[PDB]
A paper describes a structure:
The process is mediated by evolutionarily related signal recognition particles (SRPs) and their cognate membrane-associated receptors (SRs also called FtsYs in Bacteria and Archaea). The core proteins of SRPs and SRs are GTPases that each contain a structurally and functionally conserved NG domain where the G domain adopts a ras-like fold responsible for GTP binding and the N-domain adopts a four α-helix bundle fold. The low resolution, solution scattering data complements our high-resolution crystallographic analysis and shows that the crystallographic structure and the average conformation adopted in solution are similar. While the overall architecture of the archeal receptor resembles its previously described bacterial homologues from the SRP/SR GTPases family, the structure of Pfu-FtsY reveals novel features: The elongated N domain lacks the N-terminal extension observed in all other bacterial FtsYs and is instead characterized by a long N-terminal helix αN1 that packs against the NG core in a different way; sequence analysis suggests that archeal receptors may cluster apart from their bacterial homologues.
Although SRP-GTPases, especially the SR subgroup, are distinguished by their low intrinsic GTPase activity and nucleotide specificity, the crystal structure we obtained showed the presence of GDP•magnesium bound in the catalytic site suggesting that nucleotide hydrolysis took place during the course of crystallization. Identical crystals could be obtained in presence of GDP but not in presence of non-hydrolyzable GTP analogs. The previously reported Taq-FtsY•GDP structure was obtained with a receptor that lacked the first 20 aminoacids and contained no magnesium, which is required for the association between FtsY and Ffh.. The refined occupancies of 100% (catalytic GDP) and 69% (external GDP) and atomic displacement factors of the two GDPs are indicated. The GDP•magnesium bound receptor adopts a conformation close to the one observed in the Taq-FtsY•Ffh complex. Our FtsY structure identified a second and distinct external nucleotide-binding site located on the surface of the receptor.
Numbering used by the authors: 1 to 27, 36 to 86, 90 to 318
The structure:
């Protein structure tokens, strides 16, 4: 997992590690990292990362932060240190404008808390909504799901079977109905039951009459979501970022859930998407089980591309 990312960063380290070693050689208790050393290794890194599927802007940012961290620092003659700076850079690129803490922004929030999901078909949206509902239930929160994917045959029943498993109520209409009205209903429902949170499952493809971005706009306006979450399939690579970009201009994205990390041998998008969109990754999907969802933390990520 994130193997490719891990190996290209490890390659860069040992490479700078070699050209310092050489000065150690032309040798004075300490040694300094110079540009010449980095610039070249950095140039290789660029090409490596761009092959691991990291977005251009993120490779340019990493390069800046890595160079700054390395050039000038003195070392002792006779790895851990160089990797430290790289690790720092990665952390910082994973940092976002804002932070979100879900459990605390709901306890605080005036109920019901409305979360709207957006994403292209096959990204794990419905599954992810089922996982989050179960997660919020496990932490003392009452939740209900809106079946607003109304034009894809079977999606309502597909969601119904997910929600039975986890024992969550699904508010729906029927096939052919108005996606926004279903969600409006689910919200009105929760106001009356005094339910903590509503989650909205949404369409993932364009229809004869429709355009998906138009549809998400419509729903967003009717529902006034407290939070908009983009769901993207890690395996899809940089395509994930261009997808989020599209959704972000129709309806602003507040948070991200990436799925299928269990099968992501690359990691380039997971590293780049939070920076490109300026929204935090809140959870990651790591399987098809309803508990295969994990609150995201920089440490869990770094712990996976380094040690
Ligand atoms: N391996 C793996 N598969 C996942 C994960 N999340 C979703 N899936 C699978 O992706 C497929 C499509 O998911 P679905 O929720 O129907 O996607 P949707 O079209 O975006 O709603 C299903 O087979 C899910 O089991 C994950 O974290 N890991
Ligand atoms: N689609 C749908 N909407 C519901 C359901 N239950 C409640 N609602 C919404 O909740 C609103 C009223 O909530 P409620 O206190 O149960 O009853 P009411 O005030 O007499 O309508 C209705 O206008 C519905 O839009 C439901 O099972 N399905």
């Amino acid at each position: 997992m994130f193997g490719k990312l891990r190996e290209k960063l490890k390659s860069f380290v040992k490479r700078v590690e070699e050209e310092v070693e050489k000065e150690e050689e032309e040798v004075i208790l300490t040694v300094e990292i110079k540009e010449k050393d980095v610039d070249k290794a950095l140039d290789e890194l660029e090409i490596d990362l761009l092959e691991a599927d990291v977005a251009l802007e993120v490779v340019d940012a990493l390069r800046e932060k890595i160079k700054q961290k390395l050039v000038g620092k003195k070392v002792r003659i006779g790895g851990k240190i160089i990797e430290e700076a790289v690790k720092e850079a990665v952390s910082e690129i994973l940092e976002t404008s804002r932070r979100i803490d879900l459990i605390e922004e709901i306890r605080k929030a005036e109920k019901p808390y409305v979360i709207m999901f957006v994403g292209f078909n096959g990204s794990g949206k419905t599954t992810t909504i089922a996982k989050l509902a179960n997660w919020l239930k496990n932490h003392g929160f009452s939740v209900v799901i809106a079946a607003s994917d109304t034009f894809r045959a079977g999606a309502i029943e597909q969601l119904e079977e997910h929600a039975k498993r986890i024992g969550v109520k699904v508010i729906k209409h029927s096939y052919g109905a108005d996606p926004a009205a279903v969600a409006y209903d689910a919200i009105q429902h929760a106001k009356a039951r005094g339910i903590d949170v509503v989650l909205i499952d949404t369409a993932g493809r364009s229809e004869t009459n429709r355009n998906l971005m138009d549809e998400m706009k419509k729903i967003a306006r009717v529902t006034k979501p407290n939070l908009v979450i983009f769901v993207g399939d890690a395996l899809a690579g940089n395509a994930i970022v261009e997808q989020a970009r599209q959704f972000n201009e129709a309806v602003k994205i507040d948070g991200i859930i990436l799925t299928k990390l269990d099968a992501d041998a690359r990691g380039g998008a997971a590293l780049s998407i939070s920076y490109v969109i300026d929204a935090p990754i809140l959870f990651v999907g790591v399987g098809q089980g309803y508990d295969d969802l994990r609150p995201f933390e920089k440490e869990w990520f770094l712990e996976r591309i380094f040690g």
